[PDB]
Amino acid sequence: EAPLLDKKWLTFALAIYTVFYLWVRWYEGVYGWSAGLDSFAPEFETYWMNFLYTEIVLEIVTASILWGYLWKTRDRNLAALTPREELRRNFTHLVWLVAYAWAIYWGASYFTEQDGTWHQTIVRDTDFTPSHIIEFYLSYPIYIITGFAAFIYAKTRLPFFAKGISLPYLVLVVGPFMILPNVGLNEWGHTFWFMEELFVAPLHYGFVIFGWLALAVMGTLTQTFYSFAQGGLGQSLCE
Amino acid sequence: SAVRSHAEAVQVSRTIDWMALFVVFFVIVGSYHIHAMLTMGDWDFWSDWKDRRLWVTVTPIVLVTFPAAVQSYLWERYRLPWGATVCVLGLLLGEWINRYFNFWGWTYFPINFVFPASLVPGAIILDTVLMLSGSYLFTAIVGAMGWGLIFYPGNWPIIAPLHVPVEYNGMLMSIADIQGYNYVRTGTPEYIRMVEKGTLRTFGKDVAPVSAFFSAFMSILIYFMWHFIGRWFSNERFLQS
Amino acid sequence: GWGLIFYPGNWPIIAPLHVPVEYNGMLMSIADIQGYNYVRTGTPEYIRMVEKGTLRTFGKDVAPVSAFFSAFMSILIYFMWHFIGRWFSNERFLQS
Amino acid sequence: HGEKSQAAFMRMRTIHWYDLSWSKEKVKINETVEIKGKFHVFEGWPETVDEPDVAFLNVGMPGPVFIRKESYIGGQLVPRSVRLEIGKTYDFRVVLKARRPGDWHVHTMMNVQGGGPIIGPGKWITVEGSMSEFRNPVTTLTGQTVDLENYNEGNTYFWHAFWFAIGVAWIGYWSRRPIFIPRLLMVDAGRADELVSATDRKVAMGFLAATILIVVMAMSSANSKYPITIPLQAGTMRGMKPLELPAPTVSVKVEDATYRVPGRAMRMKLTITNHGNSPIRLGEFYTASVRFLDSDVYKDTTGYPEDLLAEDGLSVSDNSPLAPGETRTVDVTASDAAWEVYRLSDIIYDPDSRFAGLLFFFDATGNRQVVQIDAPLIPSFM
Amino acid sequence: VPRSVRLEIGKTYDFRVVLKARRPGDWHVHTMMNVQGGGPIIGPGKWITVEGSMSEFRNPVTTLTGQTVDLENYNEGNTYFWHAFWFAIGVAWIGYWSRRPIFIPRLLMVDAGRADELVSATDRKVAMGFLAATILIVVMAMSSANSKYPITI
Amino acid sequence: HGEKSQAAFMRMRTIHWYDLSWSKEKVKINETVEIKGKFHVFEGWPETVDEPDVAFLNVGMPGPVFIRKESYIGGQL
Numbered sequence A: 001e002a003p004l005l006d007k008k009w010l011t012f013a014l015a016i017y018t019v020f021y022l023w024v025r026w027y028e029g030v031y032g033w034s035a036g037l038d039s040f041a042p043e044f045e046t047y048w049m050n051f052l053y054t055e056i057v058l059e060i061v062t063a064s065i066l067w068g069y070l071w072k073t074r075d076r077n078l079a080a081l082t083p084r085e086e087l088r089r090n091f092t093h094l095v096w097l098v099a100y101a102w103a104i105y106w107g108a109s110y111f112t113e114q115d116g117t118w119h120q121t122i123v124r125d126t127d128f129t130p131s132h133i134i135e136f137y138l139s140y141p142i143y144i145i146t147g148f149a150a151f152i153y154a155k156t157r158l159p160f161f162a163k164g165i166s167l168p169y170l171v172l173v174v175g176p177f178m179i180l181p182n183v184g185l186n187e188w189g190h191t192f193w194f195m196e197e198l199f200v201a202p203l204h205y206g207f208v209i210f211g212w213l214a215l216a217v218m219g220t221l222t223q224t225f226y227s228f229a230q231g232g233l234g235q236s237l238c239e
Numbered sequence B: 001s002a003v004r005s006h007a008e009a010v011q012v013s014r015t016i017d018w019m020a021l022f023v024v025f026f027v028i029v030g031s032y033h034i035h036a037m038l039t040m041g042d043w044d045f046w047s048d049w050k051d052r053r054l055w056v057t058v059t060p061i062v063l064v065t066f067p068a069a070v071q072s073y074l075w076e077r078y079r080l081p082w083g084a085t086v087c088v089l090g091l092l093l094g095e096w097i098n099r100y101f102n103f104w105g106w107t108y109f110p111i112n113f114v115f116p117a118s119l120v121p122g123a124i125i126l127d128t129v130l131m132l133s134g135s136y137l138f139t140a141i142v143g144a145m146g147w148g149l150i151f152y153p154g155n156w157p158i159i160a161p162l163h164v165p166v167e168y169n170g171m172l173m174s175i176a177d178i179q180g181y182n183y184v185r186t187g188t189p190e191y192i193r194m195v196e197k198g199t200l201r202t203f204g205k206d207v208a209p210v211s212a213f214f215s216a217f218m219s220i221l222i223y224f225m226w227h228f229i230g231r232w233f234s235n236e237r238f239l240q241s
Numbered sequence C: 001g002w003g004l005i006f007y008p009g010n011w012p013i014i015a016p017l018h019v020p021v022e023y024n025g026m027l028m029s030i031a032d033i034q035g036y037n038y039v040r041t042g043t044p045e046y047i048r049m050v051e052k053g054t055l056r057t058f059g060k061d062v063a064p065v066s067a068f069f070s071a072f073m074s075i076l077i078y079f080m081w082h083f084i085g086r087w088f089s090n091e092r093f094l095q096s
Numbered sequence D: 001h002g003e004k005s006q007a008a009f010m011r012m013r014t015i016h017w018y019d020l021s022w023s024k025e026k027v028k029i030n031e032t033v034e035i036k037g038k039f040h041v042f043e044g045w046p047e048t049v050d051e052p053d054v055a056f057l058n059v060g061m062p063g064p065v066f067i068r069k070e071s072y073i074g075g076q077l078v079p080r081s082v083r084l085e086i087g088k089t090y091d092f093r094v095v096l097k098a099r100r101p102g103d104w105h106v107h108t109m110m111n112v113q114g115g116g117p118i119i120g121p122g123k124w125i126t127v128e129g130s131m132s133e134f135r136n137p138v139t140t141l142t143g144q145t146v147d148l149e150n151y152n153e154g155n156t157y158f159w160h161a162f163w164f165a166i167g168v169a170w171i172g173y174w175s176r177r178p179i180f181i182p183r184l185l186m187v188d189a190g191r192a193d194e195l196v197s198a199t200d201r202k203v204a205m206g207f208l209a210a211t212i213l214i215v216v217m218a219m220s221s222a223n224s225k226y227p228i229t230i231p232l233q234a235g236t237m238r239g240m241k242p243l244e245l246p247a248p249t250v251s252v253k254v255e256d257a258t259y260r261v262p263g264r265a266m267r268m269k270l271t272i273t274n275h276g277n278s279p280i281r282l283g284e285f286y287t288a289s290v291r292f293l294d295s296d297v298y299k300d301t302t303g304y305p306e307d308l309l310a311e312d313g314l315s316v317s318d319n320s321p322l323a324p325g326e327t328r329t330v331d332v333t334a335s336d337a338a339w340e341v342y343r344l345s346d347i348i349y350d351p352d353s354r355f356a357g358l359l360f361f362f363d364a365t366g367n368r369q370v371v372q373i374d375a376p377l378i379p380s381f382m
Numbered sequence E: 001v002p003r004s005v006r007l008e009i010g011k012t013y014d015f016r017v018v019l020k021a022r023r024p025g026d027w028h029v030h031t032m033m034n035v036q037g038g039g040p041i042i043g044p045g046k047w048i049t050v051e052g053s054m055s056e057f058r059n060p061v062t063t064l065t066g067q068t069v070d071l072e073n074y075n076e077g078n079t080y081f082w083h084a085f086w087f088a089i090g091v092a093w094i095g096y097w098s099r100r101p102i103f104i105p106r107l108l109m110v111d112a113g114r115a116d117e118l119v120s121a122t123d124r125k126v127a128m129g130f131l132a133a134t135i136l137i138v139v140m141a142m143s144s145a146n147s148k149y150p151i152t153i
Numbered sequence F: 001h002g003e004k005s006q007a008a009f010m011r012m013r014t015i016h017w018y019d020l021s022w023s024k025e026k027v028k029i030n031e032t033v034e035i036k037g038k039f040h041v042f043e044g045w046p047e048t049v050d051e052p053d054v055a056f057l058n059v060g061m062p063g064p065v066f067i068r069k070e071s072y073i074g075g076q077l
Ligand SMILES: CCCCCCC/C=C/CCCCCCCC(=O)OC[C@H](COP(=O)(O)OCCN)OC(=O)CCCCCCCCCCCCCCC
Pocket: A014, A015, A018, A022, A023, A025, A026, A028, A029, A030, A031, B097, B101, B102, B105, B106
């Protein structure tokens, strides 16, 4: 008779992102000045290019392992899922959504405007600035991994989402992912199209457009609520 | 059954309410913040970009986007009238966090030079109009008019002390202008700022009201379009491939 | 993949045409000399939309950046033209 | 920082910064440093860079470690963008005030609209002290002296906190009840009208009226507190006075200019005609912030950044007094690690292999003539 | 002036053009100034007669790498070879599927719900091999071209 | 009419009209009036006004109460 909501998992989901991104901010503060200013220097290499390579390799490994583990341990027979266990799985999926929202805030909101700050205070020299390394290649893949994991868990554990591919969930999960390829346009926007460090330039409208797809969350939320209510919780609550 | 009693169902519903509020709030923070900054953030970053023509015109038009969709979802499905307020609060929270911890905590730009614009009154007007009228067309028209018109009067108490004239080295300057001059933005030269410079067709002290009315009209249009955009975004559809 | 493989696939063909030449005191490409010698009366030199260098151009990243931008826009155009073709495949009959 | 990654020919063919001085190398907090010099606009302006019709004189540094107290182009203060003419030389002066301690690489730059950044030579300056001692006093036309570091900070905090609290209260008034699932079920069941009561309507009306009234009263109070306000001052300042410099009594033609691609040097054949000004001798070749000097003819005593100063990087086949009238063809060799360190050897990746620079000629009395040279640069691979 | 140039209003310029005869016949030759945002500005035309055979025309060019080439036929065979190779690969890919019924039986099977029977494991292996071979061949060809011509601008 | 509402600095920094003459103050119908003078273009031309590469000499009046018989800039129609 485990509790319906696992408080330890929710606390871990918040705390791991909080601590990791606080350490990332500390690293940016410590080494963003001594080594990050000049891109053709050895300290810049050993303090940011190594960071980029390590983060890319770790992101690939983590995404592969997590997605493969979630897809391998799927519930083959969901017809025997008891309503209480279905409610517990719904709470776990809600914890996954909480983690995805926290990662989305950390990526799209915090580090994007930090990148804006960095570009307004220095002269851009390379596409692999420390700000670009942290924002485009660390936070965006992290929230992409979290969203893919949440979608896979919902599809493989919740009977509500197991009957097909949820269009609002697919838009909410893949839409922000398209922000990562669009970075190329951003680079093509800064190197060829726009000669000025203007944050409202059209070369950034790609980001904006895919950010709009995050609004799909509302539709997803509705489905989630029905997944919470179809198991008998709604009937008891309406009384 | 999933729950064993009505009280347990109520407690579970309250927990779901808190968690879903967290999810909605922070997903809105991320998406609205990225859209808002990449649409109008140059005027929002610096106090010397807060002019009477471009800032007043542009900011409400591009910022009325998310509140329209979130209202169209929340009021229709839950009768929750706080969509615009929650969007504005999330955007303000993200902006202030970045200003304090990155603009000032990292690059040491003074807070009085890098502060966001106030947006709560417009969201409150929109939300109250939607709640009291109950119709999206009247809400669109009147609430968007109010949202466009109240933007500059709401921010005037903040930027008014920054417009005291100064004789700086023989030239007339504003306090915000001196702030922009002294604190060097290496990546942001002076010619980039989209501020009013005066036109031969500019008339007798009508810049700010004209900008406000134009912003209100375009806010009506953008609210009308983004209401249906959010209605599409709220679809509960399932695909088989 | 379609966006990224375009330039590596064509490099074996155009590589011999990029050997530098000192033509009449100016540095020229073999393709540049080909364009110079064989006169296109209706195609002057200023029309060619080729890279000329920008103050924001960085350290040997032109071709990869162009390839990645092309790949992203190819994603977008493929997504739109899939539905365009789906409409074009309709078996509808009109009465007027 | 940011120049090494810029195309070599773009750096060679835009703006040339000649004799520069820094008043101090180490400054304390609140102390001022003056950077003066001359900048020449190259006649063969690149086509991908817009003409400097709208240009801004800027200071390149990792942030507001200094504050730019003032900037003058031709003796005229330039707080706004200015208009520069192709082929003219201008004096520039920048007075900065130290704000943050540490070692800072400071550069003088010209931001050009439709072009991008044009960074000049950077110098390392040390600031000693504490940032808490920095003050920025400004006296207004209303008779008030304020400190720009903390001016209007409390008012902004108060108003933002007030409006955020109002929004939070508006949300929390509705947040005391069940939020998502029961309300969704009631709306689906057709009981939406039961979710809003008359008290809720009165609360919404009060919120709207209070918001409008508070905004109006706050605007009136702000107007009363500050009855004298002016709009933001902006515009492009034309009519910058250029330098009227002695035309070079020295004529230089570039026969050939080549660089070995492996390579850390550049070589050029030059025909030089002396049109008076006594026997002259080449003492320096300036390319892209890099100065190659001939120790026997000239020595820098201005503290020119050493990473960009090659004291004996100029090798002239015959650097003997060029008697007025003598037309000597000489082979000059500009060699220095800066060629590779500042990535000037990356002209091999440039879509335009042409260079430009400045030659400095000195007579027996020490008078200096500046000659401007431009040519195509041919790489050598054999 | 192998590139576009900038001219000033109200100024006079000398111009010289050296041309080399390539094809026989009588040709009306004009000197012209193409102006961007303006169009063609044709000057007086003169009739010039070229006598000989086009097969005798040569265009020798000496590169900075020490190689002398003829621009009439330089790199022609390489272009033909690569284009023919890729066209043959595409034709083979189409013809692998073209050995079976193409349009009507496959359409009926898809309509009947037997689409999964139209692709076998061998077809999947062939597609995987085609993709891997294409990528590997592109990479190897790029490496070989870089090795053959290490100096490019 | 229409100048009082134009920005003061724009009026100060564009064109200066110096010595001007009007041939007549009161005219009959079909009679002609000549307005001559000099105009100087200010060197510090405002940036929001395009350079006078395309400029037209016009007569400001509430309509065709007059007809502009001719106009000369530097002696050229
Ligand atoms: C479990 C916690 C609750 C969940 C929400 C997360 C809240 C956590 C806040 C962490 C506070 C400590 C920050 C100090 C780092 C402490 C820290 O890392 O200090 C070192 C760096 C400075 O290093 P340096 O650059 O080498 O130094 C030279 C120039 N300073 O400062 C900082 O990083 C401080 C500024 C940035 C701190 C981040 C802001 C706090 C994050 C808030 C997240 C938003 C949550 C919303 C909730 C409403």
